Structure formats: C-alpha cells, structure tokens
Amino acid sequence: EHTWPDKGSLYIATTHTQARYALPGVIKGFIERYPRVSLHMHQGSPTQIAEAVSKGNADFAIATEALHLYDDLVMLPCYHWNRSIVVTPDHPLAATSSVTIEALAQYPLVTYTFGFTGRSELDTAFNRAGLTPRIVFTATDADVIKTYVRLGLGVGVIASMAVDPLADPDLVRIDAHDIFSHSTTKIGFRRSTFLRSYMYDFIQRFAPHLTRDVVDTAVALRSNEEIEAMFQDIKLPEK
Amino acid sequence: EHTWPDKGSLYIATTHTQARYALPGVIKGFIERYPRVSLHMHQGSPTQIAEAVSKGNADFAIATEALHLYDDLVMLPCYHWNRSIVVTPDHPLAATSSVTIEALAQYPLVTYTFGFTGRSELDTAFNRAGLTPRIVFTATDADVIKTYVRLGLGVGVIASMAVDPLADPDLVRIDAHDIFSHSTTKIGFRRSTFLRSYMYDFIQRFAPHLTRDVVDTAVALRSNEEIEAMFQDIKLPEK
Numbered sequence: 043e044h045t046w047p048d049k050g051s052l053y054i055a056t057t058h059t060q061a062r063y064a065l066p067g068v069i070k071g072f073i074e075r076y077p078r079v080s081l082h083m084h085q086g087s088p089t090q091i092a093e094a095v096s097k098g099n100a101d102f103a104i105a106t107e108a109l110h111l112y113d114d115l116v117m118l119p120c121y122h123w124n125r126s127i128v129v130t131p132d133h134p135l136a137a138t139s140s141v142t143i144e145a146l147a148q149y150p151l152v153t154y155t156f157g158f159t160g161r162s163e164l165d166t167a168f169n170r171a172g173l174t175p176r177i178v179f180t181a182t183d184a185d186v187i188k189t190y191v192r193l194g195l196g197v198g199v200i201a202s203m204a205v206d207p208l209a210d211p212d213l214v215r216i217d218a219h220d221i222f223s224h225s226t227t228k229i230g231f232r233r234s235t236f237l238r239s240y241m242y243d244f245i246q247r248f249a250p251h252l253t254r255d256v257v258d259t260a261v262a263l264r265s266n267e268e269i270e271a272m273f274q275d276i277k278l279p280e281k
Numbered sequence: 282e283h284t285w286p287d288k289g290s291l292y293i294a295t296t297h298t299q300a301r302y303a304l305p306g307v308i309k310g311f312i313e314r315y316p317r318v319s320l321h322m323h324q325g326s327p328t329q330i331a332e333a334v335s336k337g338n339a340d341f342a343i344a345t346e347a348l349h350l351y352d353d354l355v356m357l358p359c360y361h362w363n364r365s366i367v368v369t370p371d372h373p374l375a376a377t378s379s380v381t382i383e384a385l386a387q388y389p390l391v392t393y394t395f396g397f398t399g400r401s402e403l404d405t406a407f408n409r410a411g412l413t414p415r416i417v418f419t420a421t422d423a424d425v426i427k428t429y430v431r432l433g434l435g436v437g438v439i440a441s442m443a444v445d446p447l448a449d450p451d452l453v454r455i456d457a458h459d460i461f462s463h464s465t466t467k468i469g470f471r472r473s474t475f476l477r478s479y480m481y482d483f484i485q486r487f488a489p490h491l492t493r494d495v496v497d498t499a500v501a502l503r504s505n506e507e508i509e510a511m512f513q514d515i516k517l518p519e520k
C-alpha cells in the first residue's frame with residue numbers, strides 16, 4: 043500500500059552523532075517505503091567507517107570525516123552544521139552578551155574527541171587565537187557530554203542539533219557559529235557500487251539537493267575536489 | 282568544608298556505557314570531596330583505553346575489556362552486569378512467558394558492536410546454540426540503540442543499567458541474565474603508578490569491596506589471574 047516492492051540490501055556505516063540526530067527521520071521514512079530492502083546499520087569511528095564501505099562491507103558511509111583516506115569513495119556534501127555551547131543556567135556564560143572564543147577558554151571544557159564528529163576545530167581553532175584551554179573531558183556523544191555538564195565538570199561544546207530544548211530543558215544553548223567554522227557531513231560510496239533507485243531516493247531524502255542527476259554528474263567527475271567545486275556556489279542545508 | 286585538600290591529577294579512560302550509567306554518581310561525589318584534584322576524563326574504545334593508561338597517559342582505565350593486551354596493567358574486578366532485551370510494547374516478545382535465546386533469534390536485532398561494551402557473547406553465544414540471527418544494527422551506546430528500537434528497526438539488547446524505567450517509559454525491559462552470561466567491569470592502572478589516597482577512595486567509591494588493603498594485596502600478586510582467583514569466592518556487585 044503505497045510502497046515500492048524493490049528488493050535489495052542497504053548497509054550504512056555512520057557515526058553516533060549521525061545515527062542519533064540526523065538519521066532517524068530518514069530511516070523511518072525509508073523503511074516504510076521499501077519493505078523488501080534489507081536495511082543494515084553499523085555505527086563506528088571514521089577510519090572503520092572509511093574501511094567498512096571502502097573494502098568493502100557497507101554500501102554508504104555517512105559522516106563528517108571530510109578527513110582523508112577517503113579518495114577511493116565518491117564523497118558528496120550533504121549539509122553543514124555547527125556547535126552550541128551548553129551550560130547550567132547558573133553559569134557565568136549564561137548571562138553573557140554573545141561570548142568570544144577567549145571568553146570561552148577561561149573555562150574547563152567538555153567536548154568531542156579527535157577524530158570523531160568534528161572537534162578538529164577545537165585546539166586547532168584554539169591555537170589559532172594562541173589559546174590553550176582545560177579540556178577536562180572528551181567524549182564521542184553529546185548525551186554523555188550533556189550529563190557531565192549537568193554535573194558541572196565543565197562547559198560543554200556539542201552539535202547544535204544535539205541540543206533539543208524539549209529533551210534538554212536544564213541547559214542553556216549558546217550558538218557558536220561565529221566562534222567555530224561549520225562542519226560538513228558528507229556521504230560516500232565506492233565508484234563500483236551499482237546505484238539502485240532506492241539508494242538515490244535515500245540520498246535525496248537525506249540531502250534534498252542530491253537528485254539523481256546531481257548525483258550522477260558528481261560521480262561523472264573524477265574527484266571529490268571537483269565535486270565540492272560543483273557545490274562551492276550551492277548553499278547547503280545548515281544544520 | 283568537609284573536603285580533602287589533597288592536590289593532584291586524576292585522568293580516567295572509560296567507555297560510553299561506563300561514563301553514562303556507572304560513573305556519574307561516583308564522579309560527582311568524588312569532585313565534591315577533592316577540590317584540588319584535577320579530574321580529567323576521556324571516553325573511547327577498549328584498545329585506546331588500554332593504550333591510554335598503558336603507555337601511558339591516563340591513570341585509570343574503566344571498562345568491560347576483560348579482553349587482553351592488558352597484562353601491563355593491574356586489573357581489578359569491580360562488578361558484574363548483564364543485558365535486558367527491550368522492545369516496543371506491541372512486540373510479540375512483550376507478551377511472552379520468559380523468552381529463550383532461540384525465541385529471541387527469530388528476530389532482527391539492534392545490539393552492541395565488537396569489541397565495545399560486551400557483545401562478545403552475541404554470536405559467540407549464538408553459534409553456541411548453532412544459531413545465526415539478523416543483526417540489522419550494531420552501535421556503541423544504548424540510547425542510539427533504544428531510539429532505533431522505538432523506530433522498529435529491530436529488537437534491542439542492551440545493558441540492564443541502560444534501561445531506566447523513568448528515562449525509558451516507552452519500552453519493555455526483559456531481563457536476559459538467564460540468556461547471556463554476565464560481563465565483568467574491571468579497573469586498570471599500571472604497576473608503577475603511585476597510588477594516592479584519593480585514588481583508593483575513588484576505587485572504593487566505585488567498587489566497595491576494593492579497600493586499600495584488598496587493592497594493595499591484589500597488586501602484591503604478579504597476575505590478573507591471581508587477582509581474579511582472589512575474588513573467585515567473592516560475590517561481586519551485580520549490576
């Protein structure tokens with residue numbers, strides 16, 4: 043009843059951050075439309091995620107590993123995203139008129155770890171202002187991080203999508219898009235993967251600008267550089 | 282005011298599961314008692330966690346990696362824990378009089394990945410009953426897993442401590458201690474680490490049976506085997 047009868051396997055290798063905040067909608071949508079597609083899902087670190095799809099278990103990889111050893115696979119820009127700073131309401135940073143990277147910094151921090159969902163600005167955006175802050179905590183998911191900010195171990199820096207005013211009503215969102223450059227989530231797959239219609243539909247459902255035609259031409263280029271050139275004048279979804 | 286003035290560094294390498302469910306209480310307790318101890322915390326995979334403490338960044342490692350390449354460090358049994366099966370209330374397994382590993386199995390599963398917080402039974406406890414089930418999903422944390430069970434991608438198997446009737450009131454806990462053997466969380470540190478009083482206190486706060494004296498004698502032995510022998514007749518906390 044309003045479903046495609048397409049039969050086939052779809053194996054995704056993705057990160058926590060992706061699996062938790064960016065993927066659920068799509069997946070629920072997808073699996074409802076394709077009851078004959080065996081959707082398998084495997085979470086993990088950028089290198090294994092690179093490894094899995096590369097040679098050669100999973101069909102797609104979904105991650106902010108704009109990082110390398112990715113050349114084998116066709117990488118496609120999906121969206122940008124940045125970070126919010128979260129604190130307990132009783133924090134000095136709460137009652138502050140737009141904080142700076144130096145105004146941060148004076149504090150002990152609970153961030154992500156490198157490399158795993160873009161802390162690849164943190165430190166490398168800190169040494170930039172010649173700064174080195176106390177990182178009392180590095181983790182891989184925001185929910186752990188959030189709960190340790192509730193403890194008061196330090197100030198947290200997480201993806202803006204990882205704050206949910208509903209889910210997180212004991213924290214203060216402070217947007218830091220000014221403070222840190224955005225991160226790009228891409229989607230990979232090796233050239234030799236035959237692209238199935240459900241796959242295009244999935245790509246499309248996850249990144250609206252990635253239509254069959256866009257996709258095809260992006261893979262017609264011999265480079266991920268060339269691809270990112272293709273979109274350098276396309277405004278991505280900003281998440 | 283009722284705090285120890287002890288000054289020093291305490292760096293912990295632990296897993297998601299540990300950081301999220303087993304560690305928060307202790308840490309909050311600890312840091313309140315030792316405002317001069319620089320508590321640093323770093324989450325990650327068993328191998329890096331082994332690596333971090335080993336050679337030789339972090340003081341303690343806290344994990345269910347009873348797995349090896351651990352010989353360098355003194356490993357101490359902390360507690361046992363097992364798994365619950367979680368499903369949507371509308372699931373066939375909900376209305377079931379104590380399910381078997383075969384009664385499971387007939388289903389698509391959302392579990393942990395190997396190696397990362399004990400799925401090292403799953404498959405190796407499945408091939409045992411000669412079984413091979415559909416694993417539509419492997420992740421590293423229960424919250425991701427739970428949410429995909431809410432989607433209906435499959436049946437979830439997570440740590441019993443990762444279900445929280447308060448936090449998770451849309452799921453069905455089904456205890457599987459019968460079904461799968463328990464896992465042991467241990468705590469490591471290399472022999473050469475001078476043991477500080479706050480460290481003993483911390484060890485103690487996390488594993489009540491690990492008193493100064495127990496600890497000392499456990500390290501007086503030349504083996505983790507010998508240590509586990511020491512406790513083979515001690516009933517551990519069961520979590």
Ligand SMILES: CC(=O)OC[C@H](N)C(=O)O
Nearest residue numbers: 063064067203247248281
């Ligand atoms: C990042 C987020 O909140 O969801 C975006 C999702 N990729 C979509 O476009 O459906």
Ligand SMILES: CC(=O)OC[C@H](N)C(=O)O
Nearest residue numbers: 302303306442486487520
């Ligand atoms: C596993 C859990 O829920 O907490 C146990 C904790 N290690 C303690 O003994 O304080």
